[PDB]
Write a protein that binds this ligand. Structure first.
Ligand code: CA
Ligand code: CA
Ligand code: CA
Ligand code: NA
Length: 183
């Protein structure tokens, strides 16, 4: 199955991929999702493929919701390739804007402790028996992040607090500096 020329052209101009790369990703996408419409269950499936033994089910749902840009309940190829482009090849600022969207569950422009607790709980569930005290619970992790990033101590992180606090921490910068998962 191949992408219509005018479609690959558009997706090439909107992502950090070449035309060949867009075509290769379309083929992988379809081999796995012949309908071209990825549902949350088949998304959760794929994360298990990458992260067996743990329980990525909740984290996969949160990630699915960011991929599902128009909030229609399915991931189509245009959403898939754009989310891949930013998460794997975006600049630091673009990656941090995308991560903010992940944590901001209700899309109101802030990340609250509870929202972040929900995501970090979900991450801890995914990894699990795959840590130091001071960071052995999602609660301790969220406390550390808010200590570092919540500059006006109001229990919320704005985009700018999240971006600057992330750029201050070398481990985070290291995680966001990957290109295709390689630095
Ligand atoms: Ca969608
Ligand atoms: Ca929010
Ligand atoms: Ca704040
Ligand atoms: Na291009």
């Amino acid at each position: 199955s191949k992408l219509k020329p005018e479609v690959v052209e558009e997706l090439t101009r909107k992502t950090y991929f070449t035309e060949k790369e867009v075509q290769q990703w379309y083929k992988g996408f379809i081999k796995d999702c012949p309908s071209g419409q990825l549902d949350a269950a088949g998304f959760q499936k794929i994360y298990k493929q990458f992260f067996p033994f743990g329980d990525p089910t909740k984290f996969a749902t949160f990630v699915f919701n960011v991929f599902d840009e128009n909030k229609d309940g399915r991931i189509e190829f245009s959403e898939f390739i754009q989310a891949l482009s930013v998460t794997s090849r975006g600049t630091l600022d673009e990656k941090l804007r995308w991560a903010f969207k992940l944590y901001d569950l209700d899309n109101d422009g802030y990340i609250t402790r509870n929202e972040m607790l929900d995501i970090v709980d979900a991450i801890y569930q995914m990894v699990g028996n795959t840590l130091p005290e001071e960071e052995n619970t999602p609660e301790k992790r969220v406390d550390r992040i808010f200590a570092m990033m919540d500059k006006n101590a109001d229990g919320k992180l704005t985009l700018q607090e999240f971006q600057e606090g992330s750029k201050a921490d070398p481990s985070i910068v290291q995680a966001l500096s990957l290109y295709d998962g390689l630095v």
